[PDB]
Design a protein around this motif. Sequence first.
Motif, PDB file in Angstrom:
ATOM      1  N   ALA A  77      26.456  -9.796   4.781  1.00 21.01           N
ATOM      2  CA  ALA A  77      26.048 -10.609   5.932  1.00 21.01           C
ATOM      3  C   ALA A  77      26.406 -12.047   5.653  1.00 21.01           C
ATOM      4  CB  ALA A  77      24.580 -10.401   6.196  1.00 21.01           C
ATOM      5  N   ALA A  78      27.654 -12.372   5.834  1.00 18.97           N
ATOM      6  CA  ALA A  78      28.188 -13.693   5.462  1.00 18.97           C
ATOM      7  C   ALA A  78      27.946 -14.698   6.562  1.00 18.97           C
ATOM      8  CB  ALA A  78      29.658 -13.550   5.200  1.00 18.97           C
ATOM      9  N   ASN A  79      28.099 -15.958   6.175  1.00 18.78           N
ATOM     10  CA  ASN A  79      28.312 -17.038   7.134  1.00 18.78           C
ATOM     11  C   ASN A  79      29.754 -17.513   7.008  1.00 18.78           C
ATOM     12  OD1 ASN A  79      28.330 -19.152   5.059  1.00 18.78           O
ATOM     13  ND2 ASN A  79      26.132 -18.754   4.927  1.00 18.78           N
ATOM     14  N   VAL A  80      30.149 -18.367   7.925  1.00 16.83           N
ATOM     15  CA  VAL A  80      31.550 -18.750   8.047  1.00 16.83           C
ATOM     16  C   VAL A  80      32.043 -19.499   6.824  1.00 16.83           C
ATOM     17  CG1 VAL A  80      31.626 -18.764  10.557  1.00 16.83           C
ATOM     18  CG2 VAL A  80      31.071 -20.923   9.335  1.00 16.83           C
ATOM     19  N   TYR A  81      31.146 -20.076   6.041  1.00 13.59           N
ATOM     20  CA  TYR A  81      31.479 -20.870   4.833  1.00 13.59           C
ATOM     21  C   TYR A  81      31.451 -20.006   3.610  1.00 13.59           C
ATOM     22  CZ  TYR A  81      30.342 -24.419   8.251  1.00 13.59           C
ATOM     23  OH  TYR A  81      30.318 -25.195   9.398  1.00 13.59           O
ATOM     24  N   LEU A  82      31.078 -18.728   3.762  1.00 12.59           N
ATOM     25  CA  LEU A  82      30.851 -17.838   2.603  1.00 12.59           C
ATOM     26  C   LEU A  82      29.951 -18.517   1.591  1.00 12.59           C
ATOM     27  CD1 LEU A  82      34.314 -16.283   2.074  1.00 12.59           C
ATOM     28  CD2 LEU A  82      32.489 -15.379   3.454  1.00 12.59           C
ATOM     29  N   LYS A  83      28.905 -19.172   2.097  1.00  8.07           N
ATOM     30  CA  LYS A  83      27.888 -19.767   1.213  1.00  8.07           C
ATOM     31  C   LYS A  83      26.741 -18.780   1.132  1.00  8.07           C
ATOM     32  CE  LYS A  83      29.550 -23.601  -0.326  1.00  8.07           C
ATOM     33  NZ  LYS A  83      30.320 -23.301  -1.548  1.00  8.07           N
ATOM     34  N   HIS A  84      26.652 -18.098   0.015  1.00  6.90           N
ATOM     35  CA  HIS A  84      25.792 -16.908  -0.140  1.00  6.90           C
ATOM     36  C   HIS A  84      24.432 -17.342  -0.690  1.00  6.90           C
ATOM     37  CE1 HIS A  84      29.493 -14.954   0.703  1.00  6.90           C
ATOM     38  NE2 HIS A  84      30.000 -15.229  -0.483  1.00  6.90           N
ATOM     39  N   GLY A  85      23.687 -18.013   0.144  1.00 11.64           N
ATOM     40  CA  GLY A  85      22.445 -18.655  -0.341  1.00 11.64           C
ATOM     41  C   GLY A  85      21.226 -17.759  -0.295  1.00 11.64           C
ATOM     42  N   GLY A  86      21.112 -16.930   0.695  1.00  6.60           N
ATOM     43  CA  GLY A  86      19.888 -16.194   0.967  1.00  6.60           C
ATOM     44  C   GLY A  86      20.158 -14.938   1.730  1.00  6.60           C
ATOM     45  N   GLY A  87      19.100 -14.201   2.015  1.00  8.90           N
ATOM     46  CA  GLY A  87      19.272 -12.930   2.718  1.00  8.90           C
ATOM     47  C   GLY A  87      20.143 -11.987   1.917  1.00  8.90           C
ATOM     48  N   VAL A  88      20.807 -11.118   2.626  1.00  6.52           N
ATOM     49  CA  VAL A  88      21.702 -10.138   1.988  1.00  6.52           C
ATOM     50  C   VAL A  88      22.733 -10.870   1.127  1.00  6.52           C
ATOM     51  CG1 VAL A  88      23.524  -8.519   2.440  1.00  6.52           C
ATOM     52  CG2 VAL A  88      21.378  -8.385   3.727  1.00  6.52           C
ATOM     53  N   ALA A  89      23.304 -11.945   1.621  1.00  6.10           N
ATOM     54  CA  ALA A  89      24.405 -12.592   0.897  1.00  6.10           C
ATOM     55  C   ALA A  89      23.879 -13.172  -0.401  1.00  6.10           C
ATOM     56  CB  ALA A  89      24.969 -13.675   1.731  1.00  6.10           C
ATOM     57  N   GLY A  90      22.742 -13.874  -0.366  1.00  8.34           N
ATOM     58  CA  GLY A  90      22.201 -14.439  -1.594  1.00  8.34           C
ATOM     59  C   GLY A  90      21.926 -13.355  -2.576  1.00  8.34           C
ATOM     60  N   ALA A  91      21.408 -12.217  -2.131  1.00 11.47           N
ATOM     61  CA  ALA A  91      21.048 -11.108  -3.022  1.00 11.47           C
ATOM     62  C   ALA A  91      22.281 -10.440  -3.605  1.00 11.47           C
ATOM     63  CB  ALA A  91      20.184 -10.131  -2.262  1.00 11.47           C
ATOM     64  N   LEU A  92      23.267 -10.167  -2.773  1.00  9.47           N
ATOM     65  CA  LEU A  92      24.508  -9.572  -3.315  1.00  9.47           C
ATOM     66  C   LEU A  92      25.147 -10.540  -4.302  1.00  9.47           C
ATOM     67  CD1 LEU A  92      26.070  -8.088  -0.073  1.00  9.47           C
ATOM     68  CD2 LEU A  92      25.129  -6.775  -1.975  1.00  9.47           C
ATOM     69  N   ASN A  93      25.223 -11.774  -3.929  1.00  9.50           N
ATOM     70  CA  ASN A  93      25.889 -12.731  -4.829  1.00  9.50           C
ATOM     71  C   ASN A  93      25.156 -12.824  -6.157  1.00  9.50           C
ATOM     72  OD1 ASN A  93      27.665 -14.927  -5.649  1.00  9.50           O
ATOM     73  ND2 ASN A  93      25.803 -16.117  -5.455  1.00  9.50           N
ATOM     74  N   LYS A  94      23.828 -12.912  -6.121  1.00  6.97           N
ATOM     75  CA  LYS A  94      23.059 -12.970  -7.390  1.00  6.97           C
ATOM     76  C   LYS A  94      23.359 -11.746  -8.238  1.00  6.97           C
ATOM     77  CE  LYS A  94      18.197 -12.932  -8.881  1.00  6.97           C
ATOM     78  NZ  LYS A  94      16.863 -12.778  -8.251  1.00  6.97           N
ATOM     79  N   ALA A  95      23.505 -10.577  -7.632  1.00  6.18           N
ATOM     80  CA  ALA A  95      23.758  -9.346  -8.386  1.00  6.18           C
ATOM     81  C   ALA A  95      25.132  -9.411  -9.053  1.00  6.18           C
ATOM     82  CB  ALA A  95      23.647  -8.157  -7.457  1.00  6.18           C
TER      83      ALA A  95
END
Length: 165
Positions: free
Chosen positions: A34-52
Amino acid sequence: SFSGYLKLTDNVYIKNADIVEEAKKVKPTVVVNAANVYLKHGGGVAGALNKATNNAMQVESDDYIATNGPLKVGGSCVLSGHNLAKHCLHVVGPNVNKGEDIQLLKSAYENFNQHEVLLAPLLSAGIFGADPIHSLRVCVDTVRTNVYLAVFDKNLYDKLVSSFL
Protein backbone atom coordinates in the motif's frame (compact mmCIF):
# COMPACT_ATOMS: atom_id res chain seq x y z
CA SER A 1 1.39 -22.05 -0.76
CA PHE A 2 -1.58 -19.96 0.58
CA SER A 3 -3.52 -21.56 3.44
CA GLY A 4 -6.47 -20.64 5.63
CA TYR A 5 -8.18 -18.32 3.09
CA LEU A 6 -11.91 -17.96 2.64
CA LYS A 7 -12.87 -17.95 -1.06
CA LEU A 8 -15.01 -14.93 -1.98
CA THR A 9 -15.13 -15.39 -5.75
CA ASP A 10 -13.49 -17.37 -8.59
CA ASN A 11 -10.27 -15.36 -8.03
CA VAL A 12 -10.47 -13.43 -4.70
CA TYR A 13 -9.58 -14.98 -1.38
CA ILE A 14 -9.44 -13.37 2.07
CA LYS A 15 -7.77 -14.18 5.42
CA ASN A 16 -7.49 -12.51 8.80
CA ALA A 17 -3.71 -12.19 8.73
CA ASP A 18 -0.80 -9.86 9.23
CA ILE A 19 0.43 -9.39 5.62
CA VAL A 20 4.04 -9.19 6.91
CA GLU A 21 3.77 -12.55 8.70
CA GLU A 22 1.88 -14.01 5.75
CA ALA A 23 4.61 -12.86 3.30
CA LYS A 24 7.39 -14.13 5.60
CA LYS A 25 5.64 -17.55 5.77
CA VAL A 26 4.49 -17.90 2.14
CA LYS A 27 7.26 -15.95 0.34
CA PRO A 28 4.94 -15.37 -2.61
CA THR A 29 5.93 -14.29 -6.10
CA VAL A 30 4.25 -10.89 -5.52
CA VAL A 31 3.36 -9.04 -2.37
CA VAL A 32 1.48 -5.79 -2.86
CA ASN A 33 2.47 -2.76 -0.86
CA ALA A 34 0.00 0.00 0.00
CA ALA A 35 2.39 2.64 -1.29
CA ASN A 36 2.20 6.36 -1.62
CA VAL A 37 3.45 8.21 -4.66
CA TYR A 38 6.81 8.99 -2.96
CA LEU A 39 7.35 5.37 -1.89
CA LYS A 40 7.86 6.72 1.62
CA HIS A 41 7.08 3.62 3.66
CA GLY A 42 6.37 5.25 7.00
CA GLY A 43 3.32 3.51 8.40
CA GLY A 44 0.48 1.14 7.75
CA VAL A 45 1.20 -1.79 5.48
CA ALA A 46 4.13 0.02 3.86
CA GLY A 47 5.86 0.87 7.14
CA ALA A 48 5.40 -2.72 8.30
CA LEU A 49 6.64 -4.34 5.10
CA ASN A 50 9.59 -2.00 4.94
CA LYS A 51 10.55 -2.65 8.58
CA ALA A 52 10.45 -6.41 7.86
CA THR A 53 13.05 -5.80 5.07
CA ASN A 54 15.34 -3.99 7.53
CA ASN A 55 14.74 -0.77 5.51
CA ALA A 56 16.10 -2.31 2.29
CA MET A 57 12.72 -1.65 0.62
CA GLN A 58 13.02 2.05 1.50
CA VAL A 59 16.58 2.33 0.19
CA GLU A 60 15.59 0.66 -3.10
CA SER A 61 12.49 2.87 -3.25
CA ASP A 62 14.45 6.08 -2.72
CA ASP A 63 16.75 5.16 -5.64
CA TYR A 64 13.61 4.40 -7.74
CA ILE A 65 12.12 7.83 -6.99
CA ALA A 66 15.45 9.63 -7.51
CA THR A 67 15.54 8.02 -11.01
CA ASN A 68 11.86 8.10 -12.06
CA GLY A 69 10.05 10.63 -9.92
CA PRO A 70 6.87 9.93 -8.02
CA LEU A 71 4.26 7.40 -9.04
CA LYS A 72 0.74 8.48 -9.98
CA VAL A 73 -2.17 7.91 -7.66
CA GLY A 74 -3.63 4.72 -9.13
CA GLY A 75 -0.24 3.63 -10.44
CA SER A 76 2.34 1.08 -9.46
CA CYS A 77 5.89 -0.10 -9.86
CA VAL A 78 7.53 -3.49 -9.44
CA LEU A 79 10.52 -3.62 -7.14
CA SER A 80 12.25 -6.34 -5.19
CA GLY A 81 10.33 -8.30 -2.55
CA HIS A 82 13.60 -8.64 -0.56
CA ASN A 83 13.11 -11.33 2.13
CA LEU A 84 9.28 -11.23 1.80
CA ALA A 85 8.56 -12.13 -1.82
CA LYS A 86 10.18 -12.33 -5.22
CA HIS A 87 8.66 -8.94 -6.13
CA CYS A 88 6.86 -6.17 -4.35
CA LEU A 89 4.17 -4.48 -6.43
CA HIS A 90 3.97 -0.98 -4.92
CA VAL A 91 0.44 0.22 -5.65
CA VAL A 92 -0.87 3.68 -4.86
CA GLY A 93 -4.50 3.75 -3.90
CA PRO A 94 -6.09 7.13 -3.38
CA ASN A 95 -5.65 8.53 0.10
CA VAL A 96 -8.99 10.15 0.82
CA ASN A 97 -7.43 11.85 3.91
CA LYS A 98 -5.54 13.83 1.16
CA GLY A 99 -8.72 14.43 -0.90
CA GLU A 100 -7.59 12.02 -3.63
CA ASP A 101 -10.29 10.76 -5.94
CA ILE A 102 -11.78 7.47 -4.68
CA GLN A 103 -12.50 6.65 -8.35
CA LEU A 104 -8.73 6.03 -8.67
CA LEU A 105 -9.14 2.94 -6.47
CA LYS A 106 -10.32 0.95 -9.47
CA SER A 107 -7.24 2.10 -11.44
CA ALA A 108 -5.10 1.04 -8.50
CA TYR A 109 -6.57 -2.47 -8.48
CA GLU A 110 -6.13 -2.80 -12.27
CA ASN A 111 -2.39 -3.02 -11.64
CA PHE A 112 -3.04 -6.43 -10.00
CA ASN A 113 -4.13 -7.83 -13.37
CA GLN A 114 -0.56 -7.78 -14.60
CA HIS A 115 0.34 -10.56 -12.11
CA GLU A 116 -1.15 -14.08 -12.03
CA VAL A 117 -1.20 -14.31 -8.22
CA LEU A 118 -0.69 -11.72 -5.51
CA LEU A 119 -0.71 -11.44 -1.74
CA ALA A 120 -2.27 -8.00 -1.09
CA PRO A 121 -3.92 -5.70 1.39
CA LEU A 122 -7.18 -3.91 0.69
CA LEU A 123 -6.10 -0.81 -1.16
CA SER A 124 -6.97 2.59 0.27
CA ALA A 125 -8.05 0.93 3.56
CA GLY A 126 -6.53 1.61 6.94
CA ILE A 127 -4.60 4.88 7.12
CA PHE A 128 -5.56 5.74 3.51
CA GLY A 129 -9.06 6.55 4.85
CA ALA A 130 -11.35 4.68 2.43
CA ASP A 131 -14.13 2.36 3.45
CA PRO A 132 -12.67 -1.17 3.35
CA ILE A 133 -16.08 -2.63 2.39
CA HIS A 134 -15.98 -0.43 -0.72
CA SER A 135 -12.36 -1.40 -1.39
CA LEU A 136 -13.25 -5.12 -1.29
CA ARG A 137 -16.14 -4.51 -3.71
CA VAL A 138 -13.83 -2.64 -6.13
CA CYS A 139 -11.26 -5.42 -5.78
CA VAL A 140 -13.71 -8.20 -6.63
CA ASP A 141 -15.16 -6.17 -9.53
CA THR A 142 -11.73 -5.19 -10.95
CA VAL A 143 -9.10 -7.84 -10.29
CA ARG A 144 -9.30 -10.92 -12.53
CA THR A 145 -6.03 -12.57 -11.39
CA ASN A 146 -5.78 -14.56 -8.19
CA VAL A 147 -5.52 -12.26 -5.21
CA TYR A 148 -5.07 -13.37 -1.61
CA LEU A 149 -6.19 -10.51 0.65
CA ALA A 150 -4.72 -10.20 4.15
CA VAL A 151 -6.89 -8.25 6.57
CA PHE A 152 -5.08 -7.52 9.86
CA ASP A 153 -8.09 -6.40 11.93
CA LYS A 154 -10.35 -9.29 13.00
CA ASN A 155 -13.46 -7.13 13.52
CA LEU A 156 -13.03 -5.69 9.99
CA TYR A 157 -12.37 -9.17 8.55
CA ASP A 158 -15.63 -10.40 10.13
CA LYS A 159 -17.55 -7.36 8.80
CA LEU A 160 -16.10 -7.80 5.28
CA VAL A 161 -17.01 -11.50 5.14
CA SER A 162 -20.42 -11.16 6.85
CA SER A 163 -21.54 -8.28 4.55
CA PHE A 164 -20.08 -9.67 1.29
CA LEU A 165 -22.58 -9.26 -1.60
